[PDB]
Structures are given as structure tokens and as C-alpha cells.
Symmetry: C4
Subunit: 233 residues, 4 copies
Amino acid sequence: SEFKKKLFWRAVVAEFLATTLFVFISIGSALGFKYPVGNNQTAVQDNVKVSLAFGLSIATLAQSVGHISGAHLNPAVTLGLLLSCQISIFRALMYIIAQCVGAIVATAILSGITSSLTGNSLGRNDLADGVNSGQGLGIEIIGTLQLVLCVLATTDRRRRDLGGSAPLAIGLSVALGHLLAIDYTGCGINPARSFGSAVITHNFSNHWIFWVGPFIGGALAVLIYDFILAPRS
Amino acid sequence: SEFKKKLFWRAVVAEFLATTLFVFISIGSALGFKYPVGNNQTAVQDNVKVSLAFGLSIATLAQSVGHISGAHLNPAVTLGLLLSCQISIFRALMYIIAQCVGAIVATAILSGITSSLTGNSLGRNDLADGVNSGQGLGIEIIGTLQLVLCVLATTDRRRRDLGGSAPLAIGLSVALGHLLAIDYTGCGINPARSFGSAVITHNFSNHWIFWVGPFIGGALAVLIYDFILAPRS
Amino acid sequence: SEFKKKLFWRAVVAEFLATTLFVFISIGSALGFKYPVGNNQTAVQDNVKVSLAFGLSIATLAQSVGHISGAHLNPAVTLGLLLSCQISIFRALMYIIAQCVGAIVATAILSGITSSLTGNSLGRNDLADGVNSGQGLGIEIIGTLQLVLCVLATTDRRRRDLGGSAPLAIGLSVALGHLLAIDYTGCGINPARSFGSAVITHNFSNHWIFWVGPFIGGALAVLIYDFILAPRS
Amino acid sequence: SEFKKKLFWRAVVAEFLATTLFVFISIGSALGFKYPVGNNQTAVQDNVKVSLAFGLSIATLAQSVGHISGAHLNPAVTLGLLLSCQISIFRALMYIIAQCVGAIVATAILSGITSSLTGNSLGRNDLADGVNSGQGLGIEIIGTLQLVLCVLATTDRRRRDLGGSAPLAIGLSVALGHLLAIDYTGCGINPARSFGSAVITHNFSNHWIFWVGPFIGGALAVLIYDFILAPRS
């Protein structure tokens, strides 16, 4: 085909342009505690605020480019479908890689508008005071797992029983991760979102855990659904 | 049948694997007040945070294994359908019993990642300072009742007027219980969730009320709908 | 008909039983600031908490008894459809009157479980420090108006363009009133909910405004939709 | 046509009457921090409260007059469809202009009921302490962009894959803007809402940015979707 070949590229575009808006609006809104409405006197973050803002941002982009890429926006999600043999071997590489770019470009646009922040966070997920060093995977490896469990089930197509909005579904499962790992890291349930969070801002401390699991956990879900709960005939 | 007999087991599996994710992510996210983002200096919980996180967690698992078990995840729910003669006499026993295991296994995975908590709660619903001792059923016996009222109505099948997401429906009715008994217990609207909350952590103080009602209240709802509001021809 | 005549009563029942659960769970959860989780040292209410809890409670009951009554639960709503000539002249009286009973019975069940409250509110909407005396209608007469605007539009039936959950729609429009008049009264967007709030608890100070508008405002909406925006051919 | 010509006017009416309710209820509920529930001793605003209240208010009005105008309610939205050649060249002028009136009339009704406010805000979006002067467009020009990205995608009609509520979709994308620019301005993602916010209250300081972008950003989205992601055959 000399058309489908070109319909592939438009998806990888609809993957970059979507993730940048996702990162920008979400990670940007996360920096609302240090940024007041009165003076310099610092505030305290709302767990719910950054849960919905990140969650709803997915359900918004999901309804916006689903029909074009599959609105993965997350390399953990991308790995889920790849292991379920849904997507193409190379499509996984084209989405993941261009997805990381979106997080770099948004951080780059935000870097100009921020500045006023007392510590200059510019989007960062850090193993908080008390949270297990390295073992912070203990949450995430069975944390990000719920989202790829949703994504895989919300797409059965064998299934005649679905209803409502599929994005609002999956996007609410993004507010689940954000409602969970809020006090833990600053919630980094998306490897590309966490990677492009500190690459030009610079701080690669514990970044290897915000990549490896996800990934394994999201792939564990494939076995839970595609091999245990809803395996193909 | 030598297939349906095996399709029963997969449901009891889809009941365990679902409840553990439910308990883990929810009960784990509940321990966000004592766990800060700055130092050791304690914070104050958000009622809304743990309402959605518990609620949305059901609507997430509900869209994820509904088609397999009926995504009960709650022994109060299980008793509702059993009294409506929907489920099997023994299916109730297989779901309830394996459901309690999920809450034990999640607590077990969480027990390693927690530790830093100043009081070491590890998921607990306690009759708070002011809340009626034993008479704390007064809320719950007409509290958990709303959820089994939703579940029974959202499944009529006689009904041609339903729309939207059935999980988001029922899952929002889980955020109703959590938006109600938040200051009261720490919201224990699910007997299996409350049981497996303290069995290895150890504290069986008032645990008999987080079992008996539910149950009766959820069964009262059967009479409200299946005998008063929408009884069968 | 010697069946439809009996199907009328079941609606008036499905109106009482629904409003009591509505009042109980909602008004009960509203008393979460004075009731702590630590000691006696008082807390500060969350505007969002009581908005969703009241809102979602409607969308829950709405999906639960819609098919039976029309899940009015509000005399402001009841007046909207009556003026649109949807419901019966006497059905309005049977719903409104039995609806007020629900609010009395729930307050009665709550009265036993409360007690610990420092001021003993037991569900009350008071013209707060700063809020216009009597002129507090200024909000509500164009406040409750949005909900009857939703209810009337979400029921066109001439309309082929509707989607999603009709309750979640209307129930979210109940969280709109609650997200608006939260600092104002303690949000009393339902005349029966506000009436049965203080009848045995006793405090009829400004209760005439939590009856007259609603009512007029809800009826103004009929003219906005059924005579201005979507009038019948 | 001597009927369609009259069906145009009813839309411009359904645009004014909708925006006034939108502005009133939303902008009115925004003034909930300065207005307490105890005495004069000031409170601190909830980011989430004003996000949903503004967002849900759109999804409420959207389900209420969609079928009549297209429930634009926002001149940024109006410009999106106009550039996509959806609406009429003059319909854009009739909606935008009458939309600004709604924001003036609501402020006028609110002006009587407010008064008690310590600073007398009456709906205002100000470049907060730290937020970039003039460069505050840096957020908004790629901020309001998400909403017109939703609106354009939620209306493809070429698209067979949509589900759930289209308002709740778009209305949640209004809570995205409000969850983002909350600490920044006081969120002014709608040019007409921000214009009619200070015209009789008087304060036109930085009002030119709460008009120009939006606009350009919303039109950039047209190029993102109608020329890059989902362009017409």
C-alpha cells in the first residue's frame, strides 16, 4: 500500500503532538503549590488537583487522536499492546521514541514560562522523604499495571458489553495512578513523561526505575488478561 | 458442560486478581497523609482523594473483568445478587472467600513498601473519635445500601433505558460510600477489604460490624428493589 | 386501568425511599468537618467533598429509580416538568409531599448516629457571615435554574443527539449547585432536603427562601427552554 | 428559507442565555475563598473546586443547548469551527458578540449579591505574583489549545468510534484549562468570560492577552487537526 504506509507517519505525528500537550498542561499544572495567587509565601499541593489534571488530560487527548494512533501516549501502554501482538514491532519503536520527544519539547516551552518557582522543579518525580529507595518499584510494578489492565480490557472488540466513553475510562485509570503515587514520587506512571521531565533540566537520579517498571508490570498485565482472564480461543 | 465448569474457575481467578489490585492501589493511596513530599512533618488527609481513588479503582476494575465475573469485588455486592437469585449458591462462596485472599495478598505486598508510616496503619477502618461504638452500623447498614441499590438497578436487563458506562456508574457509587464514611471509620464499605486489612497486621477491634452490616443492608436493598420497586412479574 | 393506577403508587414509594437515601448519605457526609479522625480538635470543610457527595448521590439514585418515577427527588425538578405539562397535576403533589417525608425520616435515622457534633447541625443551610439576608435568593433563583435547565433538556425525546449517562449528566448538575452555593448557605438547592433538614431539629430561620426560589427559578427555566429555546411545534 | 433564517436567531439567544448562566454560576462560585462559613477570617481557595465548577458548568450547558447552537459559549471555540469552515462567517460574529453580553449581564446580577468580598473581585483573572507579564500567553496559547482540540475531534462526524457524553467530554476539557491556569491567572480560557469580567467592575490591565491567545492558539489547533491529524480527503 502507498497510502497505509503514509497513514503510519500521521499516527507517529499524532503521537508526538499529543504527548507534548499532555506533558505541558499536566506537568505545568503540577507546579501550582510553589506558584501562589497572593505573594511569595509558599502553598501546599492538592493530591486530587494533579490526579484529575493528569488523568483528564489523557481522556481529553484520547478522544482527540484515538482514531489516529490509538492514543497510547505512554510507552508502558505501547508495550502492553505490543506484547498482546496488537501493534507492529516497529510501530512500538516509532511511538515510544517520538513520545519521549513530546516530553522534551513541552519541558522546553514550559522552561520559559516557569522561572518563578523557588526550587525550579520543571516536572520531576522524586522518591519522597520516607519512600523506599529503588524498592519504589514495589508500588509502580503493580501500580501502572492497573492502567494497562484497563487499556487492554477497554479494547477487547470480542466484547459486545462496552459502554460510555472509552477515553474517560482509560483517562480515569490515569487519575488512578496519579491518585496512588502522588505522595510517593510526584507520580511518574509514564516512562516518556518522566524521561523528558529531566534531560535538559538535568537530574537522572532514580530515572532507571521510572522506565523498567512500568514496562515489566505493563507486560505482566498482558499475561493477566491475554493468558489468564481473557485469552484468545 | 466440560467448558462452563472451567469458565467458573476463571471468574473466581478474575475475582482474586481484581480485588488485590483494588485493595493495593486504594488502601495504599489512603496512606498519603502520614507519608509527606517534604520531610517527616505530618500532613492532613483529603476526603475526596480517598473517595475517588477507591471509587474510580472499582470502575477501573469493573470495566476490566466485568465480562468475566460480574466484577463484584465486594462480598456485600455478592450477597445482593445471591438474594436476587442472580448468582449461584456456591459462586457466592467461591467469590467471597477468594475475594478475602486478594485483600490479604495486597496488604502483604504493601507491608514491604510502607514501613515509613509513623503509626503503621497498613489499611485500617477505625471507629473515629466521636463515632458511635458498635452503633457505627447506623451509617453503614443504610450506607453500603446505596451501592447494592446501584448494582441491582444497573443490571435490570428488563431495562431498555440504560446509558453511559455501567462501571463508572457503580464505581461512582463506591466513591459515594467513601465520600460518606470518610470521617467515620476510614471507610470500610467492603467486608473483604476491611477483613484482609488487619489479619497479619493484627487488630480485630470492631471487625464484626464491618461484616454483618454491609451484608444485612445489602440484602435489605434486594427487598427494596426486587420486592418493592422493580419486582419480577 | 387497574394496573397503571397501582404503578403510580410504586413511583411515589420509589420517590420516598430514594430521597431518604439521598438526604441521609449526603447530609450525613456534610457533617465531616466537625467530626474529625484524630480527637476533638475541629477541622475545615472541603467544598468539593460535599459537592460530589450530593451530586453523585443523585446520579446514583437517578440510575436506581429513574425507570420507576423519573427520579425527580427534588420539588424544584417536579415543578419544572409539571409546568412543561410532562407529569400529572396530582403526581406533582404525591411526589413533593412524600419527598419531604424522606428528608424527615433520614434526619430521624441520622439524629441517633450524630450526637458528637460540637454545634449539632443535623443538616442545615444557613445564610453565612456576609451572605445577603433574604436577597440570598439572588444566587438560588438563577442557581437551582441550571439543574432544571439540564433535567428538561436531558429529556427532550424529540432529541436524537443524546449520549452517555443521563443520570451522571443531571447528577453532575446537582454537583454544580453544590459547587456554587457551598460558601453561601451550605447548599440547599432542593426545597424538600432543606425543609426536612430542620422540622424535628427545629430552626425555621430563612426556610421560606429555600422553597419559593427554587420553585420560581425552576419554572423560569420552563419558559427558557419550552417557550424560548426548544418550544413544541 | 423563511424558517432557518429564524432558527439562526434562536441559536444566538441560546448562546446569550447559556453564557450568562455559565459566567454567573462559575465566576460566582469562584468567590468562595474570601466568602467564609464562620465569620470574616479569610479562607484559601481550592484549585479543584473552581476547575469542576467551571468545567461541569460547560458540560451542563452543553447538554442543555448543544442541539440549538452547538454550545460554543467560548469565542475561542467559535473561532476554531469558523477556521474549520464548519460555522457561518456571520454566525461567528453573532455568537461572539452576544456571548460577551452574557458575561456582562451575569456580572450585573452578581454585583448585587456579592458586596461582602474584602477586595471585591467580581470575577477577575490577574497575572499572579510570579506569573510572566505579557508572556502569560506562553501557557494559554498552548493552554486553551487543548479544548479546541477536543471540540474539533468530538465533532468529526466522519468518525464512527465516538462514545459516552460529548458534553462531559468537552466540559471535562474546560476543567483541564481550569486545572492548569488556576495558580496563573484565575483561569480565563474564554475571551468573553474574561472581557465581561471587568467592563462595569473596571480593570482592563492585561485584558488584551485574554483575547489574542486563545484566538491564535485555538486557530493553531485547526491546523493541527484539519490539516495535520484529520484533514478532509
